Write a protein that binds this ligand. Structure first.
Ligand SMILES: O=[N+]([O-])c1ccc(O[C@@H]2O[C@H](CO)[C@@H](O)[C@H](O)[C@H]2O)cc1
Ligand SMILES: O=[N+]([O-])c1ccc(O[C@@H]2O[C@H](CO)[C@@H](O)[C@H](O)[C@H]2O)cc1
Length: 445
């Protein structure tokens, strides 16, 4: 009774432009908000930057050959706005566009389907200098970028994601000051959450317009399974407030043309710069919803978080090196909520994986039994999802290989493939050799 997935199921791995590329000055690429952010003392746990990362710019062919070994039929990557429009708007940089053409051409000729994320956090600094995410002019700036690169590649690229993890882009970048540009203000975060949604909305008909009937496009939300520490009244209020903050702040606008009522009031409705016609734009029909899932979050009333007044409770169980609770059930539940609340015609897991302190054995091998366990569990939760009649068409592991993990630097390795930063050597981990059996059996033995 082998648990096998639908025939045309998309098995993938996922990267982002700044996390893998390096060659940060190469071929007229301009500094991104992250290139400048990495300079800030205490911003990156290990004091590193994305200047070299995985050197995937000069080494993409090797990586595609490793992907062919992994046996995937799809690859999720982000395009770097800094390479395509270095000045933010205006002159297209052909050298920049040249790279993504060589990358997509290399992918298609190995029969790997490209999934192009338009924006994975790496705005050109010169552009941010004019239109931060909290300034409404960003919407036009993003759409122009989208138009350029979707004109160049939509012949060869059918699947487009608009923006990766609005909640991250807005709260981590402007809310908690933990990501580029690293500002920390309730209003700034909300304006940014709203202009990200608006930007996703206006970019949709520009993607379809540059494509054909075969063109498919959607947003990427990160969603956590939220849980109340107790069935008490003001704890269920903390969980509900935190669920609305993370999950429902982006979902509700996208499908029901509205922010959650309780949290919108809690904040002050005036802080959110909603102009007339915005909800028409944000609700623009999409082909799929893409989902990043990592962990469960159990919540009580408290003051750890000044803004939401919540504390986090850690239930007894399995934790990754990231201090993220391992809870595959969470993935089945998130998919099922989305299925029943919003009825998206397709779902994708565009990112799921786990960081563990890897070690190269004397044999030059990487034995990561804990990552292997993590992925099996979530693959299982994804299989149980399909058997309930949830239209999950694909699954991309985060990540193909160890990379720049943002504020945690190179210390947190997510790859099913090890990278020795000393030599740039790729070693397929045990979890990778196993993933190679899964993709080719199109299921779990
Ligand atoms: O899917 N996402 O975007 C996501 C990923 C990892 C997350 O991390 C969780 O967050 C909580 C608050 O920090 C922790 O208390 C909890 O133990 C951890 O599992 C939470 C959410
Ligand atoms: O605050 N959180 O819960 C959170 C933070 C960053 C997140 O990041 C996601 O997952 C990976 C790291 O977790 C990234 O490497 C990747 O760029 C992104 O899609 C996802 C969630």
């Amino acid at each position: 009774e082998p648990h096998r997935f639908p025939p045309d199921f998309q098995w993938g791995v996922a990267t982002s432009s700044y996390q893998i590329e390096g060659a940060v000055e190469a071929d007229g690429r301009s500094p991104s908000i992250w290139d400048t952010f990495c300079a800030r003392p205490g911003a990156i746990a290990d004091g590193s930057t994305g200047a070299i990362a995985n050197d995937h710019y000069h080494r993409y062919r090797e990586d595609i050959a490793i992907m062919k070994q992994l046996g995937v039929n799809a690859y999720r990557f982000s395009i770097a706005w800094p390479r395509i429009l270095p000045d933010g708007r205006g002159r297209v940089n052909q050298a920049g566009v040249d790279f993504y053409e060589r990358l997509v051409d290399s992918l298609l000729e190995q029969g790997i389907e490209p999934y192009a994320t338009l924006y994975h956090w790496d705005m050109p600094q010169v552009q941010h200098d004019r239109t931060p995410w909290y300034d409404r002019g960003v919407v036009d700036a993003f759409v122009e970028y989208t138009d350029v690169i979707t004109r160049r590649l939509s012949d060869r690229v059918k699947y487009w994601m608009t923006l990766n993890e609005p909640w991250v882009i807005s709260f981590l970048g402007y809310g908690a000051g933990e990501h580029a540009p690293g500002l920390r203000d309730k209003e700034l975060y909300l304006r940014a959450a709203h202009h990200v949604l608006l930007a996703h909305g206006k970019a949709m008909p520009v993607i379809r317009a540059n494509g054909n009937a075969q063109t498919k496009a959607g947003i990427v939300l990160n969603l956590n399974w939220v849980n109340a520490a107790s069935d008490s009244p003001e704890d269920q209020a903390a969980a509900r407030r935190y669920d609305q903050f993370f999950n429902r702040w982006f979902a509700e606008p996208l499908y029901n043309g509205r922010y959650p009522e309780e949290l919108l009031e809690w904040y002050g409705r005036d802080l959110v710069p909603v102009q007339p016609g915005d909800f028409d734009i944000i609700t623009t029909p999409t082909d799929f919803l893409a989902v990043n899932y990592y962990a469960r979050t159990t919540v009580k009333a408290g003051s750890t978080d000044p803004m939401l007044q919540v504390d986090f409770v850690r239930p007894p169980g399995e934790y990754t090196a990231m201090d993220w609770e391992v809870y595959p059930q969470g993935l089945y539940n998130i998919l099922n909520w989305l299925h029943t609340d919003y009825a998206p015609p397709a779902l994708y897991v565009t990112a799921n994986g786990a960081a563990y302190d890897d070690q190269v054995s004397a044999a030059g091998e990487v034995d990561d039994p804990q990552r292997l366990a993590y992925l099996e569990g979530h693959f299982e939760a994804a299989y149980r999802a399909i058997q309930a009649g949830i239209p999950l068409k694909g699954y991309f592991v985060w990540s193909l290989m160890d990379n720049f993990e943002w504020g945690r630097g190179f210390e947190k390795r997510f790859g099913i493939v090890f990278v020795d930063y000393a030599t740039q050597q790729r070693i397929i981990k045990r979890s990778g050799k196993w993933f190679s059996q899964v993709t080719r059996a199109n299921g779990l033995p």
